[PDB]
Amino acid sequence: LADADAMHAKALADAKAESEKVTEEAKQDSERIAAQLSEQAGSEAERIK
Amino acid sequence: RAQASGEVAQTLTQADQQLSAQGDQVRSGLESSVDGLSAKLASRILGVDV
Numbered sequence: 001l002a003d004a005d006a007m008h009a010k011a012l013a014d015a016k017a018e019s020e021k022v023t024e025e026a027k028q029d030s031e032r033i034a035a036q037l038s039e040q041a042g043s044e045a046e047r048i049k
Numbered sequence: 050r051a052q053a054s055g056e057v058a059q060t061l062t063q064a065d066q067q068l069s070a071q072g073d074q075v076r077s078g079l080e081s082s083v084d085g086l087s088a089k090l091a092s093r094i095l096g097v098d099v
Contacts, residue, residue, distance in 0.1 A: 045053035049060075 092099040 041050070044050055048050070048053040049057050 088099050
């Protein structure tokens with residue numbers, strides 16, 4: 001019972017850690033996608049003028 | 050995109066106006082040079098000095 005409680009606490013800590021690893025991946029992604037879409041916007045604006 | 054298109058359209062309108070004005074301005078000297086051009090063309094299609 002104590003081992004299972006400790007494993008549950010470790011699982012909650014590991015869930016907090018993947019929430020971190022979801023923020024680290026998702027913020028970096030969102031930033032990169034924003035970068036490529038801004039580059040696409042600039043390229044098409046340059047092409048059009 | 051929309052700004053690029055709007056800027057392009059505005060510059061197209063301005064350029065149309067400016068280039069039309071420039072063309073009719075230059076057509077004035079065109080009508081001066083037309084006399085010499087036609088004289089030389091006549092002196093060519095005739096094969097001798099006009």
